Ligand binder design. Structure first.
Ligand SMILES: Cc1cc(-n2c(CC(C)C)nc3cc(O)c(O)c(O)c3c2=O)ccc1F
Ligand SMILES: Cc1cc(-n2c(CC(C)C)nc3cc(O)c(O)c(O)c3c2=O)ccc1F
Lengths: 300, 300
């Protein structure tokens, strides 16, 4: 029993975190086989950021401009190149702690764990969702660039996020591990801001199921709604539309609790229209939307 | 910016988790140097639990009754003994991944990370507080016994919790690593239940400071209160009394935000008397009490 925001064990990723220094900037890098991945703005000075031509700055660099430290051991950089917004520093040593890994890009609404790092040293691990507006509500101080997000499946680490910058509202923007930003953000100084966000409906539903599995039942009722009538209510309250595919995905959880998806939607409609009247669900007074259906099955 | 429930990187603890089987029971063990630590009820059958004499059950055991598996490698048990409520299985191999470690007992109100494990395999990591009633609000399914709680300080893992059982309200009870239970709980079948709980005041205050550091300010005000007048309000709302030592501990956070502790107490008094009026603090509609002052400084 119990339900917590649970990250994946981070050990497999901790063994890949290194420190990359170029000029006066030190940030974090991901060391897999004989390649070190890090944000390309490591090659920039502060005054470069207005309109950096990264093609410029990189040709003006050479291997010895990059100091790579794995723990106490210096790694010798033997090659450098750019892929989109990440830098690939080829080193002379394959990381013996390289786990089986994948570079996958996630969808808004999916979750992952973040290993927050400073100077190549892991500091903490926590769960995140990719928001519908492609930001993440992380916890990052200056120095955390290069920290990565990931899922683990059996033995295989699927890296999905690298941290690049904080936006003006305090949320976070980054790339997949091929260097392509999530969302309409760039690694140069602009007034870029997070777009408007929505609540991830299928996740809220999944979390309600986690609540029923854990003995919270006060919000259940005898009503059902149609998918169309629920979606009218969702749009009013700034929730993603619910699709039949979401309904299908919630199936297992529906079967385990004996509460039909559209039966649970009726409860969600009541919660949105009436609030909670001073009660809580799984220790929260808000509707939580950063647990996927998979996260719930995983933990329950 | 941002503020999340952040666990410590679990890699150092993952390398110590093993699987301990005795009879038909398989649970988790902590492998440090040439000793494997696990709950002593691993030697019990279900029908033993009414009034087990653990001195009994253990003398009726021998080394080969205990199967210890570290990943795929079987560990040979060469000694067994009981210390309070934990079993110490001496094995013929010192764990080469033994970190620097300590066995420390924590106080109610302190926090730690839990590496939830099944069959010796780490499943997830998350943050917990030891409640004032010595339970923890964890996330544990059957099979999770032997999972440990810990803090990390520099390079040193201070183990503070081993999981033993779930209580009827769904909260969790366990021991320190010397086998002494937190709170008035026993590893035998009774109607034992969590005692009444209170809210950890100094932590709520710390979290309010984390909120001010992150730009949440709507709950601040120009009032101050006396320590005694705040404590009258705390007792009414089932909050721990606030001591001068708590006030001292909050000092750094007070200095960093320029908000005097008793100034923040006045805000806490208003929040308790009026609620939040539909607003949120750090994404929560409840007053959070599972961040210590240290947790806040650590993350901010
Ligand atoms: C103005 C601006 C700054 C950055 N920037 C840079 C780039 C540097 C040359 C100032 N380096 C970082 C390093 C970190 O370790 C970190 O955590 C960060 O957030 C940043 C970061 O944001 C990115 C785009 C921009 F338009
Ligand atoms: C009735 C009762 C059960 C237990 N008990 C036992 C003991 C076993 C012989 C049934 N083994 C566990 C193994 C886990 O892996 C786990 O997660 C658990 O919660 C337990 C657990 O609770 C402890 C005291 C009790 F009075």
């Amino acid at each position: 029993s119990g339900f917590r925001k649970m990250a994946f064990p981070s050990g497999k990723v901790e063994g890949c975190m290194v420190q990359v220094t170029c000029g006066t900037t030190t940030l974090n890098g991901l060391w897999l086989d004989d390649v070190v991945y890090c944000p390309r703005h490591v090659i920039c000075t502060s005054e470069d950021m207005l309109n950096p031509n990264y093609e410029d700055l990189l040709i003006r660099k050479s291997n010895h401009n990059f100091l790579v430290q794995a723990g106490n051991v210096q790694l010798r950089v033997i090659g450098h190149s750019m892929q989109n917004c990440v830098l690939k520093l080829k080193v002379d040593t394959a990381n013996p702690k390289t786990p089986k890994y994948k570079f996958v890009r996630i969808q808004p609404g999916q979750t992952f764990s973040v290993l927050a790092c400073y100077n190549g040293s892991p500091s903490g691990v926590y769960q995140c969702a990719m928001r519908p507006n492609f930001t993440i509500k992380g916890s990052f101080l200056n120095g955390s660039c290069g920290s990565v997000g990931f899922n683990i499946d059996y033995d295989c680490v699927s890296f999905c996020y690298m941290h690049h910058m904080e936006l003006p509202t305090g949320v976070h923007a980054g790339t997949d591990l091929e260097g392509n930003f999530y969302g309409p953000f760039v690694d140069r100084q602009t007034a870029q801001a997070a777009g408007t966000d929505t609540t991830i409906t299928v996740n809220v539903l999944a979390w309600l199921y986690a609540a029923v599995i854990n003995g919270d039942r006060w919000f259940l009722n005898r009503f059902t709604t149609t998918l169309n009538d629920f979606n009218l209510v969702a749009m009013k309250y700034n929730y993603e539309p619910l699709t039949q595919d979401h309904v299908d995905i919630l199936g297992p959880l529906s079967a385990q609790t004996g509460i039909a998806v559209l039966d649970m939607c009726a409860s969600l409609k009541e919660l949105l229209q009436n609030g909670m009247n001073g009660r809580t669900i799984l220790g929260s007074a808000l509707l939580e939307d950063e647990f996927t259906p998979f996260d719930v099955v995983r933990q329950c």
